[PDB]
């Protein structure tokens, strides 16, 4: 158990630095973000059954809930973005600096 | 910290039951009412005193009264007995509802006789 | 003694399929006001081994604007997610025995989805592209409507398992409890194996093979292999939950023999739905499902959830 | 049949990695499905099997979708997969070197105690009620229904008020 | 728009930092910062111009990345002593990850970048609703961990907040990145006396709350976006220069103005701790941002910019202004100096 | 006529009867005569393992009785 | 009233979908509301015995609990023995 | 800041599951019932720098028993010494901890 | 580990099967064979150009549901709860707010694949 | 007919529960004599054969609370073979 | 207060709107050749679609 949940701490950093760095793609920003998601389910999920806290086993579920959520939203937003331009790149969008 | 103490296995000791759990779920109902009085000592003791290694002589008092329990359906009727748990060990969850009837001759047996 | 009951899961399973070949050519033909095969076996039942080592003896033709990993992955994906799901039927008897048997069967039937998304998004072609996009549509429509029907149904019942389901259906059906439950369910596994009406994925008059038209012989077989043993499963499953074969605890060979009866049926009533109807366009299903059937399901789900509360006919736990 | 959940983790680590290391987003979308099948696996290994089998659904459901829309707007005429720039593979490996290094490292410095290469797999499952009903996974998850309305509601209100926030967001 | 979905949205606004404010669970408190950020989004793009899109998905990602960085601390505390509240002998690591992660909610130097941007390209109301309700929930949060802080994080991220914010502020002659500029050195501020005293941030977040509110509905009145803009104001509505002085004054911590309590009472305080350094170079960086705000006053009250000919269409035309909103807290936020003691709690 | 579908619907339906029925008789085979015993809870668990110590012959289906007692 | 008998029949004869769906809605609102068996699925419930009860101190001054479980007090189960 | 509406108004939205030892679902418990039981009747009522200061002791058997870094530590001991005796020649097995032991009930 | 051990038989069955497909026929490979298909045409554009999808709303709309459809997975342990009342309530309503974001969805014509 | 099939597999998962009720103290009585019987042969084989390095006490605890704390999977399978510990970790769960 | 780093900006528009115009959606160009089964053996239907 300290093995893994140092693996999945680990995982996180990694989406982190994937969600930090962009490489030209929302999509792969978002697609980093539910990597972070998914890493913090897993660990919300081994915590509780192995503390054996049936009362926080929701926990995971409206993490679940809220993070599909704000999935949503970003995919409408990226959505709007291809829209605006058709190329959906990060750089593309930058006019608001002046 | 402190050392802890455990019992040895000279006081570890005891007369196992060495039955399987298809005959104890066909004896369960008659075991539960014979010596209830017992087994809710043991869980009374094991409930207020949460070490095991107070409780001790409680369940050696009910392997006891397990032991003469299953001495008693073994002395007096036997085969019906045998029946009944072996078609309860069949199947794969042994559901009472499946073998009622040998579950009505071994209750048959155990009212006409003790 | 397991890897016997692999076998003698595995390979009745692969021959069911095959026949199922034979028995659809056979069924629309006759349906067709002609005959189905006849020559190559004696009654016809060598044609699909011979289609079979056609198709093994074919070249496989990697094609050039092609990502090869996905293009290979894909069909093997699909043929072991068919099998997968073909692991935990009772019959009574489960090979493997799941507590949560209907998840695990919604989780393989999403991937066998995405078995057939990278074939077609692999196959670097317009016709693929399109067939992968109707099968996205076609995937959202009825995973939502299964999900809610499964919801409804096994709150009739109690866990998820089924045994459990068996155990139900020992003194009636489910179909006399929830018929409209039943013929929404029908309707969603057409759609999850992609037959006709609504096939979509593999539309022949719209676009030319859909996601199967850059892969010639050999992992096509993959893919075919993996659509009928898919059939033959949703038909299976269709008649555990709701067509209650009789269980005896003394001879399950009585059960064996009334799920193998109920199954052909319903297996013979997906060939008789594709020699009726015409195809739907995947617009028309998407709005017949999401106006039609999750409303009236979402309806029947409230109405499955008061239903034991207000006749005090909780299910068990186990 | 010890290592198997650190085995499990290690997989897990290099989807993310791949993730995070940024395909073309059908590529993502895999190493995504991928890591939800194998965490869905290690919470399986740990335990109950409901939310390993939710967030696998879910998963399933999320890329599916992302799918639909890498193909629609999120593409381009060559998407690079992982080989187009020998730096990625060459990061790739680098990291792995890495992981093995830092584990190899905290093997060595066994004074905390957070990996063990002797003691692995033997503090998986800490304590278990051997004899007990309705223990499992799910049951709390059901107890959101009676004891945790207050995390059935947001999670509801969440669920309505987002569809309003995409309706009004691709309103155009 | 439509008046169903107005509701919901404003309501769901509205429900977000309640919740994480009302709620003493920690994923209770994410799910209403989750709400806020879902909620306010919407809100954000409403025009469909390139501009809103941008700033849109700024905030989007922004907030998302700092929400995930939340929820691993709470996870990870979880892990660490099975409850849902950092209760006092969580891990350090955790702590500052959580004040790193609501410092880019917040919007404070050096995760500062985006809050002008945001604030650019977005309508005045919106951006009166962003930097005035949306800063309180993750302020909430750092109350409710009150001790138990990092001092030496805590004051960096003060000091560089402040300094950013002056230099910002001093460049920018849009109307929006000035007030955002303003927000992020008044943050600044608000998280240097965090760790000290919560009533003084409290403090400091009402008067600035009060101070921006009717700046923001005075450029909302005439739709003023540039410094030009709001400096043709005397031919438009002269009424307000004097009001729109005194707040920007007050905004800029001239004594005997409302504003200069909060820098006063939170230099009293950091006096009391021992933190004189710091003061003083948040002071001298006020007063920098008070130089801005007073270029802001020459632009559009001591002097009379040109002004042009359909401003005589414009005062031939009636207006509308809201009544017990803009004087109330105009007047509240510039001659509430000599009931200090009844501020202060 | 029609009847000629009836080859390939009989090979179906043997390649249907054969997985349950042999699924049933490994079960037997492999637990001596008597079902699979499902465990879907740790209670149930518990007694296999139980039995399966019982036994002696580190096999839970070998069902003990009462001539192991006196 | 006959505009809303005349729009009920339209849309039974038209729309014979969303009639369905919010007659099984109310219908499955109300039907816990009058129904006699609604407290008896709480009840059942309450008697399933998922644990073991923990048998309590005999201190001579509680007479309603029993002292064995063939005895006639305590909770018995014969409404749904005849249920 | 934290406003405490749910202490004036006397609901419980979330407060049942704050912790462990805290209203588990059928009759359960979450292995450390009994230490975190321990710590928190100890630190209220005190809460703040007095529980951190004179209730470590309980805090410390708590987190103890929640992440068993001293017992990971005590069994790695034992096993590498037990592994270095089996190299050494000087230790020989049991036959219950290696291979056929006498199962018992 | 039997399951596990069933998985791996299936995808070594069909990995054997592809093996045998690749292997056993005779292989002949040239330019115009292996070129794209395009119905007896070269192809104009490269077939990776943006698609352009138009159910994109009731694809956000899926999502949603789904998590829906997670919340109300749990209901056949939650109706063998000791309440039952709270959790009869908590249904209906999460039924109801469901199907009023679906009919609300259905009137503004969000699921009507806008061209 | 549902409703009346249910209510019967209520009243007979009563008796069930009640038959587990019935054998509960016998199989606790019997799990807590194993329990002690694995700690005391562990402290046994760690006691007087395994353990000779100077600064080390045999049955020291880990808790400064002196009263009983239950043993971990890990920490009473831990001296057992590799194969019986995996058997404890994965029995239940790979048993299907 | 403009310098070599920052003189090629501009002032944001007053209405928050400015000229983007692309017009290159590219909407894809598929052929119903004369091997389609829809097609009646022989045409080519050039198709410009939008999805
Ligand atoms: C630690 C062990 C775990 C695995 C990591 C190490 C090995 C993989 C490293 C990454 C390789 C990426 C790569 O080469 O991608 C190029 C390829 C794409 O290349 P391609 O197919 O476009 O081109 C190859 C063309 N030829 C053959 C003519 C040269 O992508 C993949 O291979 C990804 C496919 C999925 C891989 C994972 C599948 C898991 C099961 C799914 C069900
Ligand atoms: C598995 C068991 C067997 C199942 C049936 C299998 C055999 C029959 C197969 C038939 C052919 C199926 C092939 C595919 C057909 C696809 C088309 C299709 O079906 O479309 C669906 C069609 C759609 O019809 P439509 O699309 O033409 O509708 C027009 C709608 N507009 C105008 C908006 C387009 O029908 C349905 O959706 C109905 C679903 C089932 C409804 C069941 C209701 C039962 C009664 C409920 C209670 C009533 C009383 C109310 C309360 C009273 C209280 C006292
Ligand atoms: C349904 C499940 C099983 C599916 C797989 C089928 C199993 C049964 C297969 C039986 C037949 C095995 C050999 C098939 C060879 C097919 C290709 C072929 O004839 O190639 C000719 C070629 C002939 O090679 P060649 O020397 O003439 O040169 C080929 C190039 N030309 C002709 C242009 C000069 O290859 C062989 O003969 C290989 C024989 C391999 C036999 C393996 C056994
Ligand atoms: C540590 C932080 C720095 C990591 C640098 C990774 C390589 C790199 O420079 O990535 C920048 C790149 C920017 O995006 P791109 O569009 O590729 O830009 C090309 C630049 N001309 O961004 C990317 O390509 C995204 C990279 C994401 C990487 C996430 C996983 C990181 C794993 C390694 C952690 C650090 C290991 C250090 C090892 C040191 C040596 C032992
Ligand atoms: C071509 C590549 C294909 C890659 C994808 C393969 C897909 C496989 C099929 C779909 C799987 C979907 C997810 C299913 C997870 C298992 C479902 C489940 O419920 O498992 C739990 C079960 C025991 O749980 P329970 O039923 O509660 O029993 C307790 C008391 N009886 O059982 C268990 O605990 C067993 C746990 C292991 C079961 C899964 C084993 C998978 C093995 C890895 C396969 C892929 C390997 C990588 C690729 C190889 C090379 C191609
Ligand atoms: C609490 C509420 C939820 C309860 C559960 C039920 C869920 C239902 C979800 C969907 C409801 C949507 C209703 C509004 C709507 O969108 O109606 C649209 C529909 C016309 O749309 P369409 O069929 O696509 O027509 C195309 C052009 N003619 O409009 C029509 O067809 C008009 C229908 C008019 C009649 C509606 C049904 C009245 C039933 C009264 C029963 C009383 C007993």
Redesign the pocket.
């Given at each position: 158990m300290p093995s893994t949940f140092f693996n999945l701490t680990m995982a996180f950093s990694l989406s982190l630095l994937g969600t930090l760095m962009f490489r030209s793609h929302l999509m792969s920003t978002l697609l980093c973000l539910e990597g972070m998601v998914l890493s913090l389910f897993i660990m919300t999920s081994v915590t509780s059954l192995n503390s054996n806290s049936m009362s926080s086993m929701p926990i995971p579920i409206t993490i679940l809930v809220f993070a599909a959520c704000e999935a949503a939203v970003g995919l409408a937003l990226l959505v709007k973005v291809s829209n605006t331009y058709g190329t959906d790149y990060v750089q593309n969008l930058n006019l608001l600096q002046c | 910290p402190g050392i802890v103490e455990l019992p040895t296995l000279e006081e570890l000791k005891v007369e196992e039951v060495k039955v399987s759990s298809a005959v104890l779920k066909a004896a369960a109902h008659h075991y539960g009412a014979q010596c209830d009085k017992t087994n809710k000592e043991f869980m009374l003791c094991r409930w207020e005193e949460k070490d095991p290694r107070r409780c001790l002589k409680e369940g050696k008092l009910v392997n006891g009264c397990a032991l003469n329990f299953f001495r008693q359906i073994k002395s007096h009727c036997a085969e019906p007995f045998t029946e009944y748990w072996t078609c309860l060990d069949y199947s794969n969850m042994q559901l009472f509802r499946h073998c009622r009837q040998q579950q009505a001759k071994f209750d048959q047996c155990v009212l006409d006789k003790l | 003694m397991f890897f016997i009951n692999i076998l003698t899961l595995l390979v009745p399973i692969l021959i069911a399929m095959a026949f199922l070949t034979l028995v659809e050519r056979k069924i629309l033909g006759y349906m067709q006001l002609r005959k189905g095969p006849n020559i190559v076996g004696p009654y016809g039942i060598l044609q699909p081994?011979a289609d079979?080592?056609k198709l093994?003896?074919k070249e496989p033709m990697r094609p050039l604007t092609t990502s090869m990993s996905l293009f290979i992955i894909a069909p093997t994906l699909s043929l072991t997610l068919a099998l997968s799901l073909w692991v935990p039927l009772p019959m009574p008897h489960p090979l493997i025995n799941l507590n949560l048997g209907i998840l695990f069967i919604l989780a393989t039937s999403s991937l066998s989805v995405y078995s057939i998304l990278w074939s077609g998004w692999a196959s670097n072609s317009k016709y693929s592209l399109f067939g992968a996009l109707r099968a996205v549509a076609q995937t959202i429509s009825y995973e939502v409507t299964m999900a809610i029907i499964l919801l409804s149904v096994l709150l009739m019942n109690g866990s998820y398992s089924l045994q459990t389901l068996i155990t139900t259906q020992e003194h009636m059906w489910l179909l006399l409890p929830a018929w409209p439950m039943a013929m929404m369910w029908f309707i969603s596994t057409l759609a999850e194996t992609n037959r006709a009406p609504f096939d979509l994925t593999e539309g022949e008059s719209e676009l030319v093979s859909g996601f199967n038209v850059e892969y010639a012989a050999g992992p096509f077989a993959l893919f075919f292999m993996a659509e009928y043993t898919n059939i033959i499963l949703m038909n299976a499953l269709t008649t555990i939950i709701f067509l209650g074969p009789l269980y005896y605890i003394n001879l399950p060979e009585l059960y064996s023999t009334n799920f193998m009866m109920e199954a052909l049926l319903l297996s013979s009533t997906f060939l008789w739905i594709r020699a009726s109807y015409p195809r739907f366009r995947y617009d028309q299903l998407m709005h017949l499902l999401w106006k039609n059937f999750l409303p009236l399901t979402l309806a029947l789900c409230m109405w499955h959830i008061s239903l034991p509360i207000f006749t005090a006919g909780v299910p068990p736990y186990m | 049949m010890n290592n198997y959940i650190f085995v499990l983790s290690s997989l897990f680590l290099v989807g993310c990695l791949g993730l995070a290391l940024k395909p073309s987003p059908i590529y993502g979308g895999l190493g995504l499905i991928v890591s939800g099948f194998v965490g869905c696996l290690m919470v399986l290994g740990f335990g109950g099997s409901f939310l390993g089998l939710m967030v696998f659904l879910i998963y399933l459901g999320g890329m599916l979708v992302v799918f639909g829309y890498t193909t629609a707007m999120a593409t381009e005429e060559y998407p690079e997969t992982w080989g187009s720039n020998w730096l990625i593979l060459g990061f790739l490996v680098l990291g792995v070197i890495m992981e093995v290094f830092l584990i190899c490292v905290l093997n060595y410095y066994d004074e905390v105690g957070v990996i063990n290469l002797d003691g692995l797999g033997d503090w998986l499952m800490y304590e278990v009620d051997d004899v007990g009903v309705m223990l499992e996974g799910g049951i709390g998850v059901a107890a959101m229904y009676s004891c945790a309305t207050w995390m059935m509601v947001v999670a509801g209100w969440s669920l309505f008020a987002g569809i309003f926030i995409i309706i009004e967001i691709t309103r155009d | 728009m439509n008046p169903i979905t107005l509701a919901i949205i404003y309501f769901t606004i509205f429900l977000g930092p309640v919740i994480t404010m009302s709620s003493t669970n920690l994923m209770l408190m994410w799910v209403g910062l989750e709400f806020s950020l879902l909620a306010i989004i919407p809100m954000l793009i409403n025009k469909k111009n390139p501009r809103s899109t941008e700033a849109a998905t700024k905030y989007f990602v922004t907030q998302a990345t700092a929400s995930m960085i939340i929820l691993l601390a709470i996870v990870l505390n979880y892990k660490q002593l099975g409850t849902w509240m950092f209760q006092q002998q969580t891990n350090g690591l955790i702590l500052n990850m959580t004040l790193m992660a609501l410092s880019m909610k917040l919007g404070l130097a050096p995760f500062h970048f985006w809050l002008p941007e945001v604030t650019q390209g977005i309508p005045l109301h919106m951006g009166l609703i962003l930097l005035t309700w949306q800063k309180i929930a993750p302020l909430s949060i750092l109350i409710q961990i009150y001790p138990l802080l990092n001092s030496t994080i805590i004051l960096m991220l003060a000091i560089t907040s402040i300094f950013m914010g002056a230099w910002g502020g001093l460049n920018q002659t849009q109307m929006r990145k000035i007030m955002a500029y303003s927000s992020i050195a008044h943050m600044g501020w608000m998280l240097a006396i965090l760790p000290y005293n919560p009533s003084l941030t409290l403090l400091n977040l009402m008067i600035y709350i009060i101070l921006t509110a009717p700046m923001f509905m005075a450029l909302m009145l005439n739709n003023s976006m540039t410094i030009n803009s709001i400096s043709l104001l005397w031919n438009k509505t002269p009424a307000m220069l004097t009001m729109i002085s005194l707040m920007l004054l007050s905004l800029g911590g001239l004594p005997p103005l409302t504003g200069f309590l909060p820098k006063w009472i939170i230099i009293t305080e950091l006096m009391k701790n021992n933190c004189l350094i710091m003061a003083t170079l948040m002071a001298m960086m006020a007063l920098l941002n008070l130089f801005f705000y007073t270029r802001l006053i020459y632009s559009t009250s001591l002097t009379m910019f040109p002004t042009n000919n359909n401003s005589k269409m414009m005062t031939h035309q009636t207006k509308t202004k809201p009544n017990l909103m803009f004087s109330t807290l105009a007047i509240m936020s510039t001659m509430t100096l000599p009931l200090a003691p009844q501020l202060i709690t | 006529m029609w009847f000629e579908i009836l080859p390939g619907l009989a090979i179906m339906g043997v390649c249907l009867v054969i997985p349950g029925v042999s699924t049933a008789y490994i079960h037997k085979f492999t637990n001596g005569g008597k079902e699979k015993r499902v465990a879907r809870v740790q209670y149930q668990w518990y007694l296999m393992e139980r039995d399966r110590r019982i036994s002696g012959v580190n096999r839970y289906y070998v069902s003990k009785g009462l001539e192991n007692i006196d | 009233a006959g505009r809303i008998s005349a729009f009920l029949k339209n849309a039974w004869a038209k729309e014979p979908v969303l009639v369905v769906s919010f007659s099984v809605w109310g219908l499955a609102i109300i039907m816990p509301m009058i129904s006699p068996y609604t407290k008896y699925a709480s009840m059942i419930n309450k008697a399933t015995p998922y644990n073991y009860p923990v048998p309590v101190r005999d201190d001579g001054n509680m007479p309603d609990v029993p002292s064995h479980p063939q005895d006639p007090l305590g909770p018995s189960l014969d409404w749904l023995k005849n249920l | 800041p934290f406003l405490d509406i749910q202490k004036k108004l006397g609901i419980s939205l979330d407060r049942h599951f704050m912790f462990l030892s805290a209203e588990q679902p059928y009759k359960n418990a979450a292995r450390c019932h009994a230490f975190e039981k321990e710590w928190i009747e100890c630190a209220h009522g005190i809460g703040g720098t007095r529980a951190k200061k004179e209730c470590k002791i309980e805090f410390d058997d708590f987190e103890e028993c929640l992440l068993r870094y001293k017992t990971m530590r005590r069994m790695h001991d034992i096993k590498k010494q037990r592994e270095k005796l089996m190299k050494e020649g000087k230790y020989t097995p049991p036959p219950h901890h290696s291979g056929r032991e006498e199962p018992r009930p | 580990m039997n399951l596990y051990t069933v998985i791996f038989i299936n995808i070594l069955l069909s990995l054997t099967?592809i093996l045998?497909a690749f292997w056993?026929?005779?292989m002949?490979l040239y330019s115009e064979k292996a070129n794209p298909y395009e119905c007896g045409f070269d192809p104009t554009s490269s077939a990776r150009l943006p698609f352009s999808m138009k159910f994109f709303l009731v694809a956000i709309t899926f999502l949603l549901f789904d998590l829906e459809i997670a919340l109300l997975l749990p209901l056949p342990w939650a109706i063998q709860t000791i309440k039952t009342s709270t959790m009869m309530i908590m249904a209906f309503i999460l039924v109801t707010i469901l199907s009023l974001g679906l009919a609300y969805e259905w009137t503004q014509k969000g699921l009507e694949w806008t061209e | 007919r549902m409703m009346r099939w249910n209510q019967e597999r209520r009243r007979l998962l009563i008796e069930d529960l009640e038959a587990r009720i019935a054998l509960m103290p016998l199989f606790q009585a019997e799990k807590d004599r194993r329990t002690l019987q694995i700690l005391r042969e562990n402290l046994e084989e760690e006691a007087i054969i395994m353990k000779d390095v100077p600064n080390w006490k045999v049955g020291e605890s880990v808790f400064h609370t002196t009263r009983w704390v239950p043993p971990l999977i890990g920490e009473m399978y831990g001296l057992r073979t590799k194969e019986e510990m995996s058997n404890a970790n994965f029995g239940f769960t790979w048993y299907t | 207060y403009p310098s070599k780093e920052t003189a090629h900006w501009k002032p944001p528009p007053w209405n928050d709107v400015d000229i983007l115009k692309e017009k290159a959606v590219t909407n894809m160009t598929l052929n119903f050749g004369p091997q389609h089964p829809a097609a009646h053996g022989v045409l080519r239907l050039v198709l410009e679609l939008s999805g």
């Open positions: - | - | 081994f079979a080592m093994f003896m | - | - | - | - | - | 099967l045998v056993l026929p005779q002949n | - | -």
